[PDB]
A paper describes a structure:
The Cullin 5 ([name]) [name] E3 ligase uses adaptors Elongins B and C (ELOB/C) to bind different SOCS-box-containing substrate receptors, determining the substrate specificity of the ligase. The 18-member ankyrin and SOCS box (ASB) family is the largest substrate receptor family. Here we report cryo-EM data for the substrate, creatine kinase (CKB) bound to [name]-ELOB/C, and for full-length [name] bound to the [name] protein, [name], which binds various E2s. [name] and [name] behave as rigid rods, connected through a hinge provided by ELOB/C transmitting long-range allosteric crosstalk from the substrate through [name] to the [name] flexible linker.
We determined a ~6 Å cryo-EM structure for the full-length [name]-[name] complex. A strong preferred orientation in the cryo-EM grid limited the resolution of our map, but we were able to partially overcome this orientation bias by collecting data with a 20° tilt. Despite the moderate resolution of our cryo-EM map, both [name] crystal structures could be unambiguously docked into the cryo-EM density. Using these crystal structures as a starting point for modeling, we built a complete model of the [name]-[name] complex. We were also able to obtain a cryo-EM structure of full-length [name] bound to [name], which has previously been only structurally characterized using fragments of the N- and C-terminal domains of [name]. Interestingly, throughout the entire core of [name], the amide exchange was extremely low, indicating that the three helical sub-domains form one contiguous well-folded structure. In contrast to the low exchange throughout [name], [name] residues 41–47, 52–58, and 62–73 exchange over 80% strongly suggesting that [name] has a flexible tether that could adopt many conformations bringing it closer to the substrate. Neither the HDX-MS data nor the cryo-EM data show any indication of flexibility within [name] as had been previously suggested by simulations. Our HDX-MS data reveal that the strand connecting [name] to [name] is completely exchanging suggesting it maybe behave like a flexible tether, enabling Ub transfer by a ball-and-chain mechanism.
Author numbering:
A (entry chain C): 14 to 118, 129 to 379, 403 to 515, 520 to 780
B (entry chain R): 27 to 68, 72 to 113
């Protein structure tokens, strides 16, 4: 029975419990006798645990004294650890001589081991415990103060907490519930005290740096003072606690810093913040907001202000938009570590910037860049393209893409009629560029067609340059264009031409008809221009003038000193007052000239100042002036704006767009209804918005009107039970 | 050797289909006047095809529903311009 075997076992058991030199023979004497106890004595398994409890307790009490006696908290832990190590060692050794006990009452689940761990707690680790913990925490505090005590003292304590609760059901019960708890009590307490002491005198960024540093140090302490054996998970929560207690609390001020850093593009300071506030469950999200706000505000501020100063300054419009894009793009790439959330905040905000709303201006601006303007003359062909390349972004954001393209195309048409592009390639680039934006092929293709048409027109031109030998063929360049596209309007300001031209046109028409049967010319003299040698008393100067001006000037070909009235010129040219006045004005008041082509009695400031009785004559003193000297020959342009885009044309294009929107909407409805035979207004409107999205945003009012039309014209019909539901008809 | 001796002329003109600026062809009212539907149930405006043929937008839209080709020739239809 137990009382027969235990007397031989105990001595050995004690040695196991005191970590003494248990011999192999003793290992087995005990082991064999352990089995005998459990087998022979029905209560053996219990008695052996009891005797063990007593033997264990004796050791534990010795250990307690060996630790407890040390009123010095650190000496205490040193002793604790020492005793602990011996204790733990036996915890893992004893179950071996006692396998038979553990099997009858698995050395891993060892009941004795449990009793040992429990006894340790009962006498030491759940009482001197108070000091074990206070000490460990004072030491953890020391590590935080800078008093980097030998980490092992706290680690040791933690190892004990963990091992004591090694029970597989909750291997971290004590550790987590008490050590991590205490850790946090000390962590938060320490830093809830120090984190403010820091900021109290330190700047926000200084604190933030300290804070993050503290967090890194805490990660190290977590690897040391806290457990690493397993995933732990709660250990992360502890880091979250550090953040919350310290950083999130402070976040209330850090976000103010965010806004400031954004305004100054202080990406490094904001970079730190990004990381720190990302850790803060409710920090980085407000930062997203701040970014969005600044970008939109910049639009409402920087973009809009620019637009007002810009008028025609395309470079600034373009660059300002793109400067903002890039300024903030950079910010996000650095300050916000290229994080998709900030990229999105930016994307949305900037989209607003772009739509904060007149693509028609952007179009005018692209024209300025593309064509040979004083603006474009300062740019290398590559720079012109580059600016546009960046503009791609703007247009992608622009909702009403059709607006931009309408105006752009209107400008292209003109550019190709007059050949006033910066160069040829920039035009080709622009077309491909629009494709790069992702713009509607309808417009982009038409632009491409404009170039193809010029090619065809020039084939014809060449024929005339070779055949007409009124003038020396070659001298004339005739562009016969596709009216359906090039005749942007029905504005055909017919003008009576010089004999040299009037006697040519019949041949142009003749030849044209002989090769273009079924076709009809539209003599768009308005866009026609040419060069005449201006014979003066002082010399011979070529003039680059409009066809209308040629007709005006024609009046004096054989009589330079005769006065011809405004009205007589009107008649000679068969012009309307509006155009006549404009062309005359240039002839008698073109900018930058020291000499005007025509002289006249009353003077004008602007075209409107001419009167029917205004007499004009040929400026026989006309000359290209150089260094204030009269040249014997030269060349002067008197066209300028006479052939350049007015509020009238701008509005005509505007309505044209509106009508296109209407037409496309109506067609889209039909297409949708063919696809889905019966759908709600919501479904219809949704699909319409999507289909037309790459051009513009459809308005429900317009859609409604198109629906009514389509109903009236039997393309669709309303559902008998729902006026919002439509059914394809016919 | 006249006062303004022609040296160069950059002539610009467009072309369209000849016959006469008459009727609409689908319908038949003057291309510049109201169309079968407006002038009767009273904005009938104009539309062009890449083929340079022009009709009232209202007449060519109705026709395109039977087949998407130009009434006069028979090439695939494509709006060139809606502007007047
Ligand atoms: Zn109509
Ligand atoms: Zn046709
Ligand atoms: Zn018609």
């Amino acid at each position: 029975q137990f009382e027969d075997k235990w007397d031989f076992m105990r001595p050995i058991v004690l040695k196991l419990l005191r970590q003494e030199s248990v011999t192999k023979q003793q290992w087995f004497d005990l082991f064999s006798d352990v089995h005998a106890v459990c087998l022979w004595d029905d209560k053996g398994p219990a008695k052996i645990h009891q005797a063990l409890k007593e033997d264990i307790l004796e050791f534990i009490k010795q250990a307690q004294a060996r630790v407890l006696s040390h009123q010095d908290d650190t000496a205490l832990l040193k002793a604790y650890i020492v005793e602990w190590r011996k204790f733990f060692t036996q915890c893992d050794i004893l179950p071996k001589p006692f396998c038979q006990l553990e099997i009858t009452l698995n050395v891993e689940d060892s009941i004795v081991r449990k009793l040992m761990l429990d006894t340790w707690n009962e006498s030491i680790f759940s009482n001197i415990k108070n000091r074990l913990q206070d000490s460990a925490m004072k030491l953890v505090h020391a590590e935080r103060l800078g008093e980097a005590f030998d980490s092992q003292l706290v680690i040791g304590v933690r190892e004990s907490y963990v091992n004591l609760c090694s029970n597989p059901e909750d291997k971290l019960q004590i550790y987590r519930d008490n050590f991590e708890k205490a850790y946090l009590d000390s962590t938060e307490r320490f830093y809830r005290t120090q984190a403010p002491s820091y900021l109290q005198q330190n700047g926000v960024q200084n604190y933030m740096k300290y804070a993050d540093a503290k967090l890194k140090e805490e990660e190290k302490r977590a690897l040391r003072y806290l457990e690493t054996r397993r995933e732990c998970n709660s250990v992360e929560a502890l880091m979250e606690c550090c953040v919350n207690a310290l950083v999130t609390s402070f976040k209330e001020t850090i976000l103010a810093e965010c806004q400031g850093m954004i305004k100054r593009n202080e990406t490094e300071k904001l970079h730190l913040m990004f990381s720190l506030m990302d850790k803060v469950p409710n920090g980085i999200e407000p930062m997203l907001k701040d970014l969005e706000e600044h970008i939109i505000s910049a639009g409402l501020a920087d973009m809009v202000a620019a637009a007002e100063t810009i008028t025609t300054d395309s470079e600034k419009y373009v660059e300002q938009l793109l400067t903002l894009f890039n300024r903030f793009s950079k910010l996000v790439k650095e300050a916000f570590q290229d994080d998709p959330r900030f990229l999105t905040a930016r994307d949305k905000a900037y989209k607003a910037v772009v739509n904060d709303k007149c693509p028609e201006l952007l179009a005018n601006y692209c024209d300025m860049l593309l064509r040979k303007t004083p603006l474009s003359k300062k740019l290398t062909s590559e720079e012109i393209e580059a600016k546009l390349k960046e503009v791609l972004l703007v247009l992608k954001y622009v909702q009403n893409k059709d607006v931009f393209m309408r105006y752009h195309k209107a400008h292209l048409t003109r550019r190709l009629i007059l050949d006033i592009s910066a160069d040829s390639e920039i035009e080709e680039n622009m077309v491909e560029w629009l494709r790069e934006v992702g713009m509607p092929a309808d417009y982009v293709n038409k632009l491409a067609r404009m170039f193809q048409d010029i090619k065809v027109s020039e084939d014809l031109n060449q024929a005339f340059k070779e055949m007409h030998k009124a003038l020396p063929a070659d001298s004339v360049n005739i562009k016969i264009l596709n009216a359906g596209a090039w005749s942007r309007s029905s504005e055909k300001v017919f003008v009576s031409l010089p004999t040299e031209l009037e006697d040519l046109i019949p041949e142009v028409e003749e030849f044209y008809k002989k090769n273009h049967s079924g076709r009809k010319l539209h003599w768009h003299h308005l866009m026609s221009n040419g060069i005449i040698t201006f014979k003066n008393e002082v010399g011979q100067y070529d003039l680059e003038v409009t066809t209308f001006q040629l007709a005006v000037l024609f009046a004096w070909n054989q009589r330079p000193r005769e006065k011809i009235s405004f009205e007589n010129l009107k008649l000679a040219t068969e012009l309307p007052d509006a155009e006549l006045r404009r062309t005359l004005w240039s002839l008698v008041a073109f900018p930058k000239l020291k000499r005007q082509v025509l002289l006249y009695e009353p003077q004008v400031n602007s075209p409107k100042d001419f009167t029917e009785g205004t007499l004009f004559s040929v400026n026989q003193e006309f000359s290209l002036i150089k260094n204030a000297k009269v040249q014997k020959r030269g060349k002067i342009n008197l066209i300028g704006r006479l052939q350049l885009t007015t509020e009238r044309m701008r509005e005509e294009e505007n309505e044209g767009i509106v009508q296109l929107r209407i037409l496309r909407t109506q067609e889209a409805i039909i297409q949708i209804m063919k696809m889905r035979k019966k759908i709600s207004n919501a479904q219809l409107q949704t699909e319409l918005v999507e289909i037309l999205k790459n051009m513009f945003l459809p308005q429900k009012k317009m859609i409604k009107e198109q629906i009514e039309w389509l109903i009236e014209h039997k393309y669709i019909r309303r559902d008998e039970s729902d006026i919002n539901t439509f059914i394809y008809m016919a | 050797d006249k006062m303004f001796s022609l040296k160069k002329w950059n002539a610009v003109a467009m072309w369209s289909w000849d016959v006469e600026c008459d009727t609409c062809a689908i319908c038949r009212v003057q291309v510049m006047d109201a169309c079968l539907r407006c002038q009767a149930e009273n904005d009938c405006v104009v539309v062009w095809g890449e083929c340079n043929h022009s009709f009232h937008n209202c007449c060519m839209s109705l026709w395109v529903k039977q087949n998407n080709r130009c009434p006069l020739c028979q090439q695939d239809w494509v709006v060139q311009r809606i502007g007047k």
